[PDB]
Amino acid sequence: SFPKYKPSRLATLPATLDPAEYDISPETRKAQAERLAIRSRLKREYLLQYNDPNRLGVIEDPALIRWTYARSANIYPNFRPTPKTSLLGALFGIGPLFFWYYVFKTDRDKKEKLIQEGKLDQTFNISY
Amino acid sequence: DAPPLTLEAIKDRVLYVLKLYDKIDPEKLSVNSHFMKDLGLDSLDQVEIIMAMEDEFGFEIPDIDAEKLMCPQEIVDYIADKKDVYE
Amino acid sequence: KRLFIIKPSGFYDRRFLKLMRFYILLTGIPVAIGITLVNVFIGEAELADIPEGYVPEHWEYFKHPISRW
Amino acid sequence: MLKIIIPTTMLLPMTWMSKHNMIWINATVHSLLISLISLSLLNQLGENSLNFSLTFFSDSLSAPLLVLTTWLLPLMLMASQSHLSKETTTRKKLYITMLILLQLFLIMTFTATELILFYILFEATLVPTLIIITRWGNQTERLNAGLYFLFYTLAGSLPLLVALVYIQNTTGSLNFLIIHYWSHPLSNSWSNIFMWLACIMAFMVKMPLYGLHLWLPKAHVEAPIAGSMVLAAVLLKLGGYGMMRITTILNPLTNYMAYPFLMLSMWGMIMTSSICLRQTDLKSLIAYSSVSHMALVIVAIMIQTPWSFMGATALMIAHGLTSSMLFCLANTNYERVHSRTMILARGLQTLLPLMATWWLVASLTNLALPPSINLIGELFIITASFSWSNITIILMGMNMMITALYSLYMLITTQRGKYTHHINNIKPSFTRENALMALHILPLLLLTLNPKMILGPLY
Amino acid sequence: SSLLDLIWLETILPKTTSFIQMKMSIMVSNQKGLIKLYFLSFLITIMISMTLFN
Amino acid sequence: AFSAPAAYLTHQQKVLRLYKRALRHLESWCVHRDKYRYFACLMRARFDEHKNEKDMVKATQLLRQAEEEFWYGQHPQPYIFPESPGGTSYERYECYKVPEWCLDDWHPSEKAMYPDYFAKREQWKRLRRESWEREVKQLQEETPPGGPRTEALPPARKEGDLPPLWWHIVTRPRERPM
Amino acid sequence: HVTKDMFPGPYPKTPEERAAAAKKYNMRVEDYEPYPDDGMGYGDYPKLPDRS
Amino acid sequence: IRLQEDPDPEDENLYEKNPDSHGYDKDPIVDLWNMRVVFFFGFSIVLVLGSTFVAYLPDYRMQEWARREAERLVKYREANGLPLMESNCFDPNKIQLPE
Amino acid sequence: PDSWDKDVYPEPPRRTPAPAPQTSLPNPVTYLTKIFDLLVDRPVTLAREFIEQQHAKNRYYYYHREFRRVPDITECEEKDILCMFEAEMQWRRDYKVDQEIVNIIQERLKACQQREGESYRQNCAKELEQFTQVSKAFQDRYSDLGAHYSARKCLAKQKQRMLAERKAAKEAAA
Ligand SMILES: CCCCCCCCCCCCCCCCCC(=O)OC[C@H](COP(=O)([O-])OCC(O)COP(=O)([O-])OC[C@@H](COC(=O)CCCCCCCCCCCCCCCCC)OC(=O)CCCCCCCCCCCCCCCCC)OC(=O)CCCCCCCCCCCCCCCCC
Ligand SMILES: *P(=O)(O)OCC(C)(C)[C@H](O)C(=O)NCCC(=O)NCCSC(=O)CCCCCCCCCCCCC
């Protein structure tokens, strides 16, 4: 029939085409009810604080605080030297350095060879 | 820029569209008539009425809110509140 | 019908800009007037050969009157 | 130089003897007067330096740094009086005393004529900075930040002390003039390699060099506003000044020993710009921008051409002013909402118009926008690096693109969009804050008008 | 930010050195305060200084 | 926007949303009014053809196939109203929306420029402050012990009360503020 | 006002730890899923869907 | 609780007590005079006077001196047929090369 | 004008063709030039006359500094700090003068290209040769000294160049 749509990581699967959207178990309905209950509880708390007339300031967001903490200060305590981390770190932190070193050293060696052989167009190169 | 809307203007335009609907009898159409309890339409007809109102006033009614607009008075109130009409 | 336009308080920003303009122009305008008068009346020096046996000073080696001062 | 040194040592007793409510007024007024007096040092000669005495001398490289330090002191006073309202009188006076001591040490550091006196002063600058950070910082991490800053700097600088005393024993003098006139080539041997390494590594840690830079985010994020202003504006310039001074005696070994440092600086410039792209904290974003710009300055000093040195000096001055302004703006936002997260407060353009203008101007200068001195310095460094090699242009172009990206991203995130609904304590901007931003920004444009004053001796 | 700045540049220079110094400090200062033990140590030191230093 | 969402969309809600989306995309394809009316009548004819279906499994399969057909045949650039989320005029006036808490930080001279507005504003503030305790009491009386199971709020059950959590809904900025 | 128990912690290795983490992040225990323990520093932070 | 600790104080607003506050000090008179001295000294004195002083600093870098010297040397050398730029910085007669 | 030296800054004689109109139509350029002279040129000339009258009442003079020659780094002994200082300062002054010489030649080149316009490739060959020679000599003198250049380094470079030239001459004669 119609050509199928293949989702990617940068073009995800639409909800209307998700197979799980048309196969609803009774437990799925109670999961959705629990999710709505959690959202409603959080919404009620935020709205009460928001509409409080005596509140002056910023409603601190525990979720935002957890996010900013986990992004920076929680990374090193939870890092372990593994083969994957070691290889990725060595690659991403050493390979570019030596690649650029090889490129620049080769270029400058060729330039110096031309300078010594005296066949490089260096006229008008007054500023250096 | 454009002239401001009024409650009477919104009501007149919604009733104008509903009277230009064929499935609705113009004589028995009042601002309190229910689209299904006392007009005899169904869900698809209500969807078409909402789409006609969207085309009429040039703005979109979300599906979550449009399903509940079961009366011309409800449509008038919704559009007036969304467009910030108080007179 | 005119409707009230809700805006943040611009009084403090306007006051700061007014004070900044006043204090820049408090000394800037006299400086500009003085520079203009000096340039109009006490013009720049004219280059000349050093008379034999005369030893000038550094301000006599410089050209603009303000730089010489 | 005593006409500038003594008024600071008189700022000390005046601050300690003034009344409890006149401390800020007196300190600000007399700091501004001292800055005006120090403006007279910009009249330099084309042949040699200004040799005041056997102890202090001034050059085209020292003079703008001294003017920047003296102008930076009153701005730190204004920010401090913003955030230290509830402090006791004695602690306010101690804070002002630490700032005054830091300024005095910096002045004597830039004007010292011997390498050993320069070392003693530039190591003495650590104590007031460490006390300020670890005493008046806000958060818990100030202690760890102080430890990192202190031990990085000292581990860098101790081999420098050993190398300096060795060089004095070898040659007879550490006076800069004598070692410039009696300079001799450095043979390619392991001993010379390690002497080169000792000196350069001290100043590279002070710069900082990429891979030796973690203390910079740690210290700049966790220091009070005055500490952040002085750390980025002036204290990062001690490494550049030292490298521009000591490399007289390290030739021709610098031609061969500069490869690892050049590669580190270029790649780390790219890496820190990319890090800035994905930062959840505003102060961390500004700190990593500082790292990128100082990496560019390191590249300039290492390639070591007359066009690179002018670019290095211009970029140092421009970065000092711009980073100080950015830290002040971030601190005003923090004082509004008591948090450093970038996405917590938005719509600050529709809530605070003139601050939005200041943010726009500072962010425009943070990226190289012509004809600002930031662009002048960056362009000179890029041109010298192009004459050095023709792929440095690739690296510099990538860095410029990412710099524009993260600067405008910070501006768009903080200022544009819709305001956060629940943040209802954003009072209108103070005349003090607006005046602080004006005093940061106007001298930069005046320097753009007169650019030969900050291009160094090589001009 | 994560792999290099927060993890490996921290592990190489400041973290490894601090860990080594902490371990050496624990080793040095973990003594039971027994004169028998550290006087036997004195005897070993005397023998070594006599034999290995000429 | 003004209505609290539910936990899930029933089959009727799903099919009605699909019907509206298909009608909008068909209008995008059929630019002209007569052609659009013809093809919209045909589309409603298909919906009415499948309208009576006792088997919910078959109805769900028909819905799934219709959704796949829609996704294949959707307009790449459908018409969006200017003020709608995808529209060109969307969020244009968000920079002009200023809140009343920002209004109360005015200088006394600025406030004196509008003597009558701020008297009514003070009246509104008194009304808000005199009702918060009753609002919170009403909210906590009607909530289940477990907590709010939905995002809907109750009305004012008493003659002198206001619906709980009303201040920001009532005082939200106008759609064309400046 | 956030206590020391409301901050992200180590990778959960027991169902009690997983339940406590899910409660901490205001998530259902069935919906909670941490990043795989590869020593990348994620910790017990949930792996939410990669959408926008 | 584990301590007898003070509650975190509410943020203090300078605009509440003093509507026309410059944000320097709590005392209105001290705040006004702090603003006045900062603005006057900084903007007026430092900005204007230092900028004009720097603009009219004497030409101690010898830019115009060097230009006049170069003009004289160019005139003399092209009048006499000598090269405009000398080939050597020093005198090879005074330089003694190794054998 | 007597402001600058015509020999240092040459300008070819200006050949302006006489107008030869062929139509009876008025010339808008001529009318607008007359308007510009009447409205702008006369008032600015009067203002400059007044300013120059005010200047002539306060006529004072400034002089050009003359530096006598001093022994150079070749004459200075090894680690004789005073002679080294004098020679280094003299070398720096000579460096500045040479830079200004190159600047003058470059200004000649630019002005000649602009003046010649569309025939610049052929009519500016004379100024291109002078610039080539001056730039070649300046580059050989101060090409790769570095950021910390000094009279000693320039002398060492000259010694290296002289040794190379001597070796080349010997090889050619061999
Ligand atoms: C608040 C927000 C903003 C904040 C900003 C940040 C904060 C800033 C703080 C202040 C920073 C100051 C920085 C230092 C500045 C110091 C001054 C300085 O360096 O002056 C250098 C220099 C002054 O020359 P000098 O080196 O002192 O003397 C050399 C000569 O000896 C002189 O020649 P002379 O002696 O033969 O005669 C010239 C004389 C006499 O010339 C004339 O009289 C000219 C007459 C022209 C019309 C003649 C015909 C019409 C006559 C009508 C009547 C006819 C009948 C009557 C005739 C007379 C009676 C018979 O005029 C002058 O000398 C004028 C001097 C002006 C000095 C300005 C000083 C400013 C001080 C700093 C504070 C500023 C604060 C702001 C407020 C300023 C005041 C509003 O140039 C200027 O001041 C600028 C002149 C610009 C003229 C036009 C140039 C071309 C423009 C178009 C270019 C292309 C388009 C570009 C876009 C459009 C333009 C932007
Ligand atoms: P009212 O409350 O009466 O609503 C009646 C409903 C529909 C709720 C029924 O009670 C009902 O549920 N009936 C059983 C289920 C059912 O009718 N399903 C039908 C849904 S799909 C169907 O069969 C029709 C879909 C065909 C059209 C698909 C659109 C594909 C083309 C789109 C192209 C877009 C651009 C042209």
mmCIF file of C-alpha atoms and ligand atoms in Angstrom, chain C residues 20 24-25 28-29 31-32 35-36 39-40 44 64, chain D residues 442 446, chain H residues 48 51-52 55-56, chain I residues 43-44 47-48 50-51 55, ligand 1:
data_model
loop_
_atom_site.group_PDB
_atom_site.id
_atom_site.type_symbol
_atom_site.label_atom_id
_atom_site.label_comp_id
_atom_site.label_asym_id
_atom_site.label_seq_id
_atom_site.Cartn_x
_atom_site.Cartn_y
_atom_site.Cartn_z
ATOM 1 C CA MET C 20 25.095 60.606 32.555
ATOM 2 C CA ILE C 24 29.573 64.152 30.490
ATOM 3 C CA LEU C 25 28.512 67.576 29.194
ATOM 4 C CA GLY C 28 32.903 68.085 27.935
ATOM 5 C CA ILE C 29 31.308 71.312 26.704
ATOM 6 C CA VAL C 31 36.652 71.402 27.054
ATOM 7 C CA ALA C 32 35.243 71.637 23.528
ATOM 8 C CA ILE C 35 39.867 73.620 22.399
ATOM 9 C CA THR C 36 37.992 75.568 19.729
ATOM 10 C CA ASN C 39 42.740 76.406 17.820
ATOM 11 C CA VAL C 40 41.119 79.567 16.445
ATOM 12 C CA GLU C 44 49.707 75.643 15.739
ATOM 13 C CA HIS C 64 50.273 71.770 18.960
ATOM 14 C CA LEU D 442 32.921 53.844 27.320
ATOM 15 C CA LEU D 446 37.627 55.457 23.362
ATOM 16 C CA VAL H 48 36.658 63.660 29.590
ATOM 17 C CA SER H 51 40.601 61.259 27.051
ATOM 18 C CA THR H 52 41.575 64.783 25.993
ATOM 19 C CA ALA H 55 44.537 62.777 22.684
ATOM 20 C CA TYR H 56 46.890 65.743 23.118
ATOM 21 C CA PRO I 43 31.611 81.399 3.324
ATOM 22 C CA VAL I 44 34.259 78.774 4.061
ATOM 23 C CA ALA I 47 35.936 81.797 7.701
ATOM 24 C CA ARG I 48 39.417 80.522 6.871
ATOM 25 C CA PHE I 50 39.368 85.157 9.589
ATOM 26 C CA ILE I 51 41.043 82.167 11.250
ATOM 27 C CA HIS I 55 46.725 83.002 13.645
HETATM 28 C C1 LIG J 1 26.532 60.842 26.148
HETATM 29 C C2 LIG J 1 26.592 59.586 25.308
HETATM 30 C C3 LIG J 1 27.897 59.432 24.540
HETATM 31 C C4 LIG J 1 29.123 59.241 25.418
HETATM 32 C C5 LIG J 1 30.404 58.983 24.642
HETATM 33 C C6 LIG J 1 31.575 58.526 25.500
HETATM 34 C C7 LIG J 1 32.231 59.610 26.338
HETATM 35 C C8 LIG J 1 33.052 60.598 25.528
HETATM 36 C C9 LIG J 1 33.850 61.578 26.367
HETATM 37 C C10 LIG J 1 34.690 62.549 25.554
HETATM 38 C C11 LIG J 1 35.772 61.892 24.710
HETATM 39 C C12 LIG J 1 36.732 62.882 24.072
HETATM 40 C C13 LIG J 1 37.894 62.267 23.313
HETATM 41 C C14 LIG J 1 39.006 63.257 23.007
HETATM 42 C C15 LIG J 1 38.673 64.299 21.954
HETATM 43 C C16 LIG J 1 39.551 65.537 22.021
HETATM 44 C C17 LIG J 1 39.423 66.434 20.798
HETATM 45 C C18 LIG J 1 40.224 65.939 19.633
HETATM 46 O O1 LIG J 1 41.003 65.027 19.677
HETATM 47 O O2 LIG J 1 39.973 66.644 18.529
HETATM 48 C C19 LIG J 1 40.697 66.250 17.341
HETATM 49 C C20 LIG J 1 40.489 67.224 16.209
HETATM 50 C C21 LIG J 1 40.589 68.662 16.646
HETATM 51 O O3 LIG J 1 41.709 69.266 15.966
HETATM 52 P P1 LIG J 1 43.019 69.685 16.773
HETATM 53 O O4 LIG J 1 44.004 68.594 16.616
HETATM 54 O O5 LIG J 1 42.633 70.112 18.135
HETATM 55 O O6 LIG J 1 43.581 70.934 15.955
HETATM 56 C C22 LIG J 1 44.085 70.743 14.617
HETATM 57 C C23 LIG J 1 43.953 72.029 13.838
HETATM 58 O O7 LIG J 1 44.955 72.950 14.271
HETATM 59 C C24 LIG J 1 42.594 72.661 14.000
HETATM 60 O O8 LIG J 1 42.271 73.446 12.831
HETATM 61 P P2 LIG J 1 42.197 75.039 12.905
HETATM 62 O O9 LIG J 1 42.919 75.490 14.114
HETATM 63 O O10 LIG J 1 42.622 75.554 11.587
HETATM 64 O O11 LIG J 1 40.654 75.415 13.052
HETATM 65 C C25 LIG J 1 39.709 74.459 13.575
HETATM 66 C C26 LIG J 1 38.842 75.127 14.604
HETATM 67 C C27 LIG J 1 38.017 76.221 13.993
HETATM 68 O O12 LIG J 1 37.289 75.631 12.894
HETATM 69 C C28 LIG J 1 36.135 76.202 12.554
HETATM 70 O O13 LIG J 1 35.698 77.187 13.083
HETATM 71 C C29 LIG J 1 35.461 75.450 11.448
HETATM 72 C C30 LIG J 1 34.437 76.285 10.698
HETATM 73 C C31 LIG J 1 33.622 75.461 9.724
HETATM 74 C C32 LIG J 1 32.576 76.249 8.964
HETATM 75 C C33 LIG J 1 33.142 77.408 8.170
HETATM 76 C C34 LIG J 1 32.199 77.930 7.106
HETATM 77 C C35 LIG J 1 30.889 78.479 7.636
HETATM 78 C C36 LIG J 1 31.008 79.837 8.295
HETATM 79 C C37 LIG J 1 29.671 80.484 8.611
HETATM 80 C C38 LIG J 1 29.779 81.969 8.905
HETATM 81 C C39 LIG J 1 30.438 82.757 7.785
HETATM 82 C C40 LIG J 1 30.586 84.238 8.071
HETATM 83 C C41 LIG J 1 31.397 84.548 9.317
HETATM 84 C C42 LIG J 1 32.842 84.082 9.259
HETATM 85 C C43 LIG J 1 33.671 84.491 10.465
HETATM 86 C C44 LIG J 1 33.696 85.989 10.703
HETATM 87 C C45 LIG J 1 34.214 86.770 9.516
HETATM 88 O O14 LIG J 1 37.907 74.123 15.105
HETATM 89 C C46 LIG J 1 38.349 73.278 16.045
HETATM 90 O O15 LIG J 1 39.470 73.282 16.473
HETATM 91 C C47 LIG J 1 37.269 72.341 16.491
HETATM 92 C C48 LIG J 1 37.714 71.514 17.685
HETATM 93 C C49 LIG J 1 36.643 70.596 18.242
HETATM 94 C C50 LIG J 1 37.099 69.933 19.529
HETATM 95 C C51 LIG J 1 36.107 69.005 20.202
HETATM 96 C C52 LIG J 1 36.571 68.619 21.596
HETATM 97 C C53 LIG J 1 35.729 67.590 22.330
HETATM 98 C C54 LIG J 1 36.176 67.415 23.773
HETATM 99 C C55 LIG J 1 35.685 66.166 24.484
HETATM 100 C C56 LIG J 1 34.295 66.229 25.096
HETATM 101 C C57 LIG J 1 33.134 66.098 24.125
HETATM 102 C C58 LIG J 1 31.784 65.963 24.812
HETATM 103 C C59 LIG J 1 30.578 65.948 23.884
HETATM 104 C C60 LIG J 1 29.988 67.317 23.564
HETATM 105 C C61 LIG J 1 30.820 68.198 22.645
HETATM 106 C C62 LIG J 1 30.159 69.522 22.316
HETATM 107 C C63 LIG J 1 28.798 69.354 21.688
HETATM 108 O O16 LIG J 1 39.244 66.939 15.482
HETATM 109 C C64 LIG J 1 38.046 67.082 16.076
HETATM 110 O O17 LIG J 1 37.887 67.530 17.177
HETATM 111 C C65 LIG J 1 36.942 66.597 15.184
HETATM 112 C C66 LIG J 1 36.738 67.458 13.947
HETATM 113 C C67 LIG J 1 35.808 66.812 12.931
HETATM 114 C C68 LIG J 1 35.495 67.676 11.720
HETATM 115 C C69 LIG J 1 34.806 66.926 10.594
HETATM 116 C C70 LIG J 1 35.625 65.767 10.060
HETATM 117 C C71 LIG J 1 34.996 65.020 8.898
HETATM 118 C C72 LIG J 1 33.680 64.352 9.235
HETATM 119 C C73 LIG J 1 33.145 63.442 8.143
HETATM 120 C C74 LIG J 1 33.957 62.177 7.929
HETATM 121 C C75 LIG J 1 33.244 61.132 7.087
HETATM 122 C C76 LIG J 1 31.870 60.767 7.623
HETATM 123 C C77 LIG J 1 31.892 60.139 9.007
HETATM 124 C C78 LIG J 1 30.554 60.166 9.731
HETATM 125 C C79 LIG J 1 30.129 61.543 10.218
HETATM 126 C C80 LIG J 1 31.022 62.126 11.300
HETATM 127 C C81 LIG J 1 31.093 61.263 12.536
#
